[PDB]
From a paper:
Genomic and biochemical analyses of the FPU-7 strain have revealed that the bacterium secretes at least seven chitinases, one of which is a unique high-molecular-mass (150 kDa) chitinase, termed ChiW. This enzyme has three surface-layer homology (SLH) domains (~18 kDa); it is specifically expressed on the surface of the bacterial cell and degrades chitin. Based on comparative sequence analyses, ChiW has two glycoside hydrolase family 18 (GH-18) chitinase catalytic domains (~42 kDa each) and one carbohydrate-binding module family 54 (CBM-54) (~25 kDa), as classified in the Carbohydrate-Active enZYmes (CAZy) database. In this study, we have determined the crystal structure of the bacterial cell-surface enzyme ChiW and demonstrated that this elaborate monomeric enzyme is composed of six distinct structural domains.
Thus, two truncated mutant proteins have been prepared to determine three-dimensional structures, i.e., ChiW-SLHd (Val198 to Lys1418), lacking the signal peptide and SLH domains, and ChiW-CD (Val557 to Lys1418), which is composed of the two catalytic domains. The two monomeric proteins exhibit very similar hydrolytic activities for chitin. Crystals of ChiW-CD have been obtained and preliminary X-ray crystallographic analysis of the crystals has been reported. However, the crystal structure of ChiW-CD could not be determined solely by the MR method using the Bacillus circulans WL-12 chitinase A1 catalytic domain (BaChiA1CD) as a reference model (amino acid identity = 47% for the 1st catalytic domain and 45% for the 2nd catalytic domain); the electron densities except for the two catalytic domains remained obscure. In this study, we have used the automated model building software (Buccaneer), and the structure of ChiW-CD was completely modeled by the program and the structure was refined at 2.03 Å resolution. In the catalytic region, the three-dimensional structure of Cat-1 closely resembled that of Cat-2, consistent with their high degree of amino acid sequence similarity (56% identity). Superimposition of the 355 residues of Cat-1 and Cat-2 gave a root-mean-square deviation (rmsd) of 1.0 Å and the surface models of the two clefts are similar. The two subdomains protrude from the core β/α-barrel and form the walls of a deep active cleft of approximately 42 Å in length and 26 Å in depth. In the solved structure, the two clefts cross each other at approximately right angles. The Ig-1 and Ig-2 domains might serve as linkers or scaffolds for the two catalytic domains.
Numbering used by the authors: 559 to 1416
The structure:
Amino acid sequence: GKIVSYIPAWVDWAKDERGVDATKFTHLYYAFGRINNGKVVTIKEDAKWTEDPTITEADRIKRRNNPDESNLAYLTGLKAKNPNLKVLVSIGGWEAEGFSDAALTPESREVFANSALDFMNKYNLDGIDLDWEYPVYGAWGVIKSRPEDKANFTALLKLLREKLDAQSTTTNKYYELAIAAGASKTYTDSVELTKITPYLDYINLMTYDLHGGWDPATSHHTAVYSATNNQLSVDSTVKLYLNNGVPAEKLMVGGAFYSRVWQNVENKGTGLSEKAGSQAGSPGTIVYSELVNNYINKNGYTRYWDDTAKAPYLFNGSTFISYEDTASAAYKAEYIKQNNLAGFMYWEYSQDSDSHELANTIYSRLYAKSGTPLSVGTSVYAGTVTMATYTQLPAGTFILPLTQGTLKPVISASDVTVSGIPAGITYTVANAADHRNAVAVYVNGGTVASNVYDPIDVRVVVKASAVLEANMTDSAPASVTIMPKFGPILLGYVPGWVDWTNSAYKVDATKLTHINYAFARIKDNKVVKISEDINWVNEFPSEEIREQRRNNPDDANFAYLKTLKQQNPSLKVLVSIGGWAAEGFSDAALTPETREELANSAIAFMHQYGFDGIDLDWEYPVYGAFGVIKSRPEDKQNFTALLKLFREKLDVEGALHGKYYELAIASAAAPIYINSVELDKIHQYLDYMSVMTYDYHGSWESKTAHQASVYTSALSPGDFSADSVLTAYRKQGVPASKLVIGGAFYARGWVNVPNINHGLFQQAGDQAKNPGTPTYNDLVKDYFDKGYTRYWDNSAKAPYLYNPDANGGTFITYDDEESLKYKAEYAKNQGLRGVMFWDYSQDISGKLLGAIFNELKA
């Protein structure tokens, strides 16, 4: 199943902020090469293009220096990311002149075709595509044309295939030849389809601009089916081509990442099949990204759907817009599959939304296995409604965009099951205003039956019935959050290896809600201070270190925390048992006796030193962090039993002490962790999981990336981010209100990083001179004004540093005030329990904590 993406020459692709994700298609067509004195040339050498009257001067100096060479290098560069990618040059396009002359004579055909190969070979291309629009009728006078174009097109294609084949017998590389073909009967009548088709790998059908403001009434411009007899469609065009004998296996169906517009449409019905007046004022087309930004269910435009054509359109009473969306793209991809066609071609990739929604939809739908219907998918845009008091819930609205599936323009109450809205609170569902494809759940203001001390998980199922596409199943239940009146948690790791009492830098209990004290440890299946952990105390041979570790200031720290809790009585201080390289959990978790023994010893430790709960930091079950710790496959279900039992023991303690003791874990981001821990079964025992949304990348790898980005960078599709990890957690079924997003107050980086794109996503050299983990404190002292410059990846919302001159080029990846703000903002919009960070000692300025606090609690 192929996917042809047309990519425009007139975007500077090396500069483009978002770049091209070539893992979502199979063929990249570079639009366009042009013809000039019978020869194929770069578009910058097409005077007709580089000096058009229409948008002129400021934007015409641009065109003269179009960066074609650089574009072609960047695009054929994308083979690193998709090795099976083919890149072809598309020659021609709308209004491109010179085919009729180029094809005229055996001689002019010879020089065109030789230059076509020369272009193909010069830029390392996999084939040639001819977009002659159109032979014989010349698009009715847009381009020069002659009645002999019909046979001359045949001879031209014959000659190209001969020469590509000749070259193939010598290089052993197969070369593609394709055309973009017109959808009209006039097109089929001006070319010899049966003669031509043996020369071509496939025929890209231009099944768009089928109708437009040149017609007296509105219609669909790129519809899958014909809803009336006079409306052209993908189906009517494919049937036309099959009837002329073109095999289904050589036809690609076209789609458009832009709309056709009609103005002055009579305001009747939905605007569809209505009479349209003057188009003189019309923009003609509006690209999909602009539709998303300013038109689809926005600014007075209503979204409508034609359930026969399988096509969306918009109308606001005067302007009608016909476009391609997620639902039409799915129906087109199902048409391709059901009719055995070659695939999906689209014009053109840069018109898509920033996050490549159409390109991504077409990939996902076209390589969906049949007989496995797809579930509707959700995300969250507004995930939190916050209690005003213990009983009073103000009005608010959960907003869940779909990521897979397309809501009907108006959904019904029965399309959505919401569970967990508290008793005596009414709600309704609907399509969220100002979003193209989102469920709103409006929660009526109200009074809850009993006091809300803890977050309420609200669970939203989007039924197969809510959606346009054909054979989909109900969504997984989407978690959002009713938050109790005190709002999100702000949790700090506080290291026990700092002597807090004699430190001039103190812990700010007015800004934290929670502290994890790092760490208690496990010895002989008993919980002990870190000073009794012989593996830690003697991690290093030097006695001066071991003596500092033997004298770890734990007692002093426990008195320090006791004071702090006396001064800030709503502060919760948990003891963290474990951490990096901490032993004993696999053994402790094994049997009911070993778990009993561990839980009772932990409980004893907790009471002895004045803690308000327990956090387990087992790093990590089953894989043992790749043999840093003892592990077993029984860890997976034994961790569940350990937490069940810790929770029971803590219930016993709170029932005896008239108080509530928290239980939490710190959990990792990587797929292997997620597959090692029964996340859907443990969350019930936990107040929250402190997800370590950092250490994604570092010196252990030979390429740079963001260690802690809140969003996945546009230029590293599929890469780790808080969003990607926390979404994976939610799809295991963890409620949002039991997730805590993590910030790191330390950096990772790479040395020997080349000075290309400021070191971001580059190959690095030998890492013996690597920074390791410089703290924000070290960045302030040694990096920030010392020849590193700070950059910002605005798609990832992640800062980074780069110094060309330090150890062969050094890239530093970290969290700062700005990224922490965005993590805190994600927590709030996603309905998460709150924010955590590691660790309090790493920023003595207070800025990083202040950044979180300012955003999160204000």
